[PDB]
């Protein structure tokens with residue numbers, strides 16, 4: 066195993082042999098990888114087009130180096146709501162208010178919204194565990210939990226272009242949720258992620274908006290990879306089938322203060338395209354959550370998930386869970 | 397112009413816009429490119445498959461950053477003999493000595509790893525400044541440009557090469573950035589599509605060059621099989637198939653063609669008159685460079701040019717002129 070061997074293989078457009086991706090990630094996590102080698106690998110793998118086995122090794126090794134949460138502090142039915150690259154933050158809160166444990170994993174952009182809302186996002190494992198137990202939701206700040214990734218994070222900024230590493234966020238949640246709604250901006254890489262979750266024995270909905278969104282929207286149809294029990298089902302999803310009005314991407318589009326205001330409005334009951342998108346993804350995460358204890362029918366599962374997501378807002382539960390989340394950090 | 401744009405375009409398998417490659421390389425040549433950005437650029441363009449225009453822009457920038465030789469020290473008809481590397485430093489090194497001994501000025505360009513290593517094993521002083529390389533050309537008829545000495549600004553790229561350790565588009569720059577700027581030569585490449593790219597760059601320069609690709613992976617004309625030759629001259633490129641058998645050369649084996657000291661011994665044997673596959677390959681490539689040299693001042697017929705090139709190359713060995721030139725080369729550095 067060497068960088069010449071692995072990189073040479075990728076630049077010949079060949080899939081890696083077993084363990085090679087894992088070796089590369091280990092060199093990164095130990096700090097032995099040079100920036101040039103990280104970049105070469107990220108770019109070469111991306112242009113080659115990564116496989117689930119390769120992504121599974123990258124995410125697997127990285128996750129094993131992450132700060133774990135304390136033993137028995139994360140429910141077995143905890144879920145994630147996230148995309149690879151607004152709505153996922155809101156959806157996470159709603160799902161939590163519906164009675165589903167949610168544990169997110171994120172970073173500040175070049176998480177910011179949660180800070181603008183007064184949430185203390187940068188907490189250690191013990192307090193994230195307490196947050197999950199007392200508020201019903203927790204947030205793992207990525208730099209806090211993945212410090213060994215910092216050189217790769219720097220590389221990713223310096224090159225600026227999306228690479229295979231942009232798939233690692235949803236696959237390296239330190240709390241190791243077994244369920245969730247996972248959004249991917251590219252159909253090619255969406256199926257790859259579904260394969261990784263499949264091997265993990267996760268129950269997730271890997272979603273890809275046919276408009277290029279990394280989450281279920283009301284702008285157009287979406288492709289969903291239904292992952293459960295090690296199997297993947299590819300489906301098409303039309304929100305219109307659930308009486309949702311179509312919208313434009315302009316409405317689902319700002320700064321932290323603006324995003325924070327959007328959150329309070331939606332949680333405050335404000336109707337519109339933004340709310341609809343939040344309810345869709347929240348429902349998706351709930352349907353994924355149900356996929357742990359059962360394998361119910363697609364339509365009626367979504368009917369139930371949409372009902373719970375909607376009620377979580379309209380009860381004031383979501384708005385009040387947020388308030389409790391802010392009060393938690395203050396005390 | 398920025399890295400996210402250029403790298404974005406490349407990873408999308410799109411050719412760059414005019415000027416972008418040059419911008420990228422200059423950022424690299426000025427220490428303004430992060431190692432990650434250098435590696436990302438080199439790898440991305442490699443897998444995209446570089447164009448002659450892109451490589452030409454890279455080579456143009458790198459060459460403009462290089463130290464020149466003094467004015468009026470490099471003859472107009474100086475040649476280079478080199479391969480971009482196999483997947484053959486013994487062959488090219490010997491061919492260069494033979495060509496010089498034939499009366500054709502030769503100026504080489506290489507580094508330690510290796511091209512320069514074999515010469516050091518032979519006792520040649522490789523790391524000389526412009527004025528001494530100039531003296532070597534005039535007094536010995538051959539000169540060597542030590543790549544780190546003449547391309548100091550390439551140090552950031554050179555470090556990245558080592559760290560990734562895989563061939564990239566950058567490996568094409570050597571023959572295209574010879575700081576003596578020979579207008580002719582024999583240039584080898586282990587891959588056909590990259591050979592065609594380099595031929596395109598030499599064409600744009602109006603150079604007289606044979607770009608060669610052994611159909612067995614050799615970055616030089618081989619005896620083991622046929623070769624493709626891009627005959628570059630007068631801004632145009634003829635793509636030709638080449639069979640040494642047509643000149644009476646026996647079909648050798650690749651195994652018949654590793655340390656610098658081992659290569660150094662092979663040089664002394666061949667230049668000493670030892671016959672075999674290696675001699676044949678040396679004479680072929682040397683003859684090729686002489687054909688290229690002829691293309692500077694005339695459009696000669698292909699076969700007669702080669703026959704004359706083979707005649708002179710063989711003579712340069714048989715008379716002992718090649719062996720003696722090496723000796724003078726060594727002595728020159730000792731003094």
Ligand SMILES: O=C(O)c1ccccc1Nc1ccc(OCCCCCP(=O)(O)O)cc1C(=O)O
Nearest residue numbers: 171172207208209211212214215218219231234
């Ligand atoms: O930059 C640092 O120097 C640093 C220092 C201490 C700890 C962490 C540090 N950097 C990071 C480490 C992990 C990370 O994120 C881990 C990858 C998962 C993030 C999810 P994303 O792909 O959506 O951003 C990001 C950074 C960073 O600089 O931003």
Ligand SMILES: O=C(O)c1ccccc1Nc1ccc(OCCCCCP(=O)(O)O)cc1C(=O)O
Nearest residue numbers: 506507511543544547548550551554557569570
């Ligand atoms: O190797 C160095 O030590 C070096 C130091 C400072 C600046 C540049 C350095 N290396 C190079 C200089 C020019 C170059 O390109 C032109 C010469 C190409 C020589 C190819 P060869 O090794 O097969 O002869 C390549 C390198 C390099 O190490 O990659």
